[PDB]
Amino acid sequence: GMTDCEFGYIYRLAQDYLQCVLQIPQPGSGPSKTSRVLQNVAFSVQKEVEKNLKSCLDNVNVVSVDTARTLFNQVMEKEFEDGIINWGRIVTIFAFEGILIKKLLRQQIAPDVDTYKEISYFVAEFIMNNTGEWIRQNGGWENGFVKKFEPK
């Protein structure tokens, strides 16, 4: 609906994707249809980015949540600096947080089990504040993203 651009909904999407990447999906009903569609498309992008930018990424050290947040903000700023927003770019936000959590898992100096909750938080912060208006105007997650990316 129109309310799916609120912070709580986006935070759940970002947390769902990191739990997918970390192979710790929460039990119960399971992820929403939006999250189910997103996880497949975002993971496809993540694998391709990891392959194409292996040298640059292998060169990066994500040693803390603060370094993850600063790098995330710096990368997102440049990706979106041209003012263009579309669903493909929104997908790469999730793909990049998946790259970040994987590097943190290996490189975090003081690893903590709630780390992925912090990462997904500032990811939702960026999505809502920088793309929330566009997402709403383009049908939200249910009538926009899922309609375009679900199977035909």
Binding site: V41, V45, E48, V49, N52, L53, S55, C56, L57, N59, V60, L71, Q74, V75, M76, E77, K78, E79, N86, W87, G88, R89, V91, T92, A95, F96, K148, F149
Partner: peptide, 23 residues
């Protein structure tokens, strides 16, 4: 690599993903 190659590499992968469902 660096921030730049990563960010604009992400942008390129995005606009491709986007275009490939834009029918």
């Amino acid at each position: 690599x660096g921030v730049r190659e990563i960010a604009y590499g992400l942008r390129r992968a995005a606009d491709d993903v986007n275009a490939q469902v834009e029918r």
